[PDB]
Amino acid sequence: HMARNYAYPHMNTLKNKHNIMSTKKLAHVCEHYAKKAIINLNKEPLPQKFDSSYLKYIHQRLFESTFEWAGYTRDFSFTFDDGTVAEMPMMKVPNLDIFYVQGNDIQENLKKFDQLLASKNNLQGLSREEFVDEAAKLFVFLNSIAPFRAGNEPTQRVFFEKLAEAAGHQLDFSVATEKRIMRACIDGMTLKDNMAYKEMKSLFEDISDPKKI
């Protein structure tokens, strides 16, 4: 019942601070502010701890001009300015018959995500190959959580680009096609144990290659 409260009562478009009713126009305005926020974000030092708090902060910065719930995950019972309360425990993977992590498990998974990074020292002190391997596995995991109502993709990309930088390497998702990145995410959620990570590893190899220039 509460999931419909993220969108307008009379249109499917997501509620937003711009009062924009076209999903197409909203997307554009959204990309605009996200880009502006990245400029200020890039001036800040890299955090000591790479964790869900930092992920939320990125999402907050990317979307605070557009979404009232920016920075809040979809298990958070969010009160809009209009008085309605929104929450989204069930979110399906688009076009496929699988679900992202259920709302009630988001916190435990994000905690596990935080623990892995901390245990592995934010993937520092590794070779580019080792980083690529570990990073790809963590990316697949986080992708399957999809902790936010929307804006998961650009948020997780900024997070991993920052993680790579702090780990002494580089990741530039813009060097690869959207079709390929999606294909890797899908493989990550559909293929058996070993194979799930393969396309993501392959992607990360390419987008971490300085000759990307």
Residue numbers in the entry: 8 to 220
Give excerpts from the publication.
Proteins containing a FIC domain catalyze AMPylation and other post-translational modifications (PTMs). Among these, Bartonella effector proteins (Beps) comprise a particularly diverse ensemble of FIC domains that subvert various host cellular functions. The FIC fold comprises eight conserved α-helices and encompasses a characteristic active site loop between helices α4 and α5 that forms most of the catalytic center and the substrate binding pocket. Additionally, FIC domains generally contain a β-hairpin between helix α2 and helix α3 that is referred to as the “flap” and mediates docking of a target segment in extended conformation via β-strand augmentation.
BepFIC domains with a glutamate (E159) in position G2 are represented by the B15_Bep8 and B11C_Bep8 structures, which are virtually identical. Although the motif is highly degenerated to PFxxGNE, the fold of the domain and, in particular, of the active loop are canonical. Nevertheless, the binding of a triphosphate-nucleotide appears to be impossible due to the presence of the side-chain in position G2 (compare Figure 9A and Figure 9B). However, simple outward rotation of the glutamate side-chain allows the accommodation of an AMPylated side-chain in a constellation very similar to that of the Tyr-AMP target side-chain in the IbpA/Cdc42 complex. Intriguingly, the model would allow binding of water molecule to the N-terminal end of α5 ready for a nucleophilic attack onto the phosphorous, which is in line with its phosphoester bond with the tyrosine, i.e., it is ready for deAMPylation of the modified side-chain. The strict conservation of a glutamate in G2 may then point to a role in water binding and proton abstraction, i.e., the glutamate would function as general base. About one quarter of BepFIC domains display a glutamate in the G2 position which would clearly interfere with the triphosphate-nucleotide binding mode observed in AMP transferases, i.e., with the γ-phosphate forming a salt-bridge with R2. However, binding of an AMPylated target to members of this group of BepFICs appears possible, which suggests that they might act as deAMPylases with the glutamate in G2 involved in binding and deprotonation of the hydrolytic water. B11C_Bep8 FIC crystals were grown from a solution of 30% (v/v) Jeffamine M-600 and 100 mM HEPES free acid/NaOH, pH 7.0. Data for Bqu_BepC FIC with ADP, Bcl_Bep1 FIC, and B11C_Bep8 FIC were collected at 100 K on a Rayonix MX-225 detector at a wavelength of 0.9786 Å on beamline 21-ID-F at the Advanced Photon Source (APS, Argonne, IL, USA).
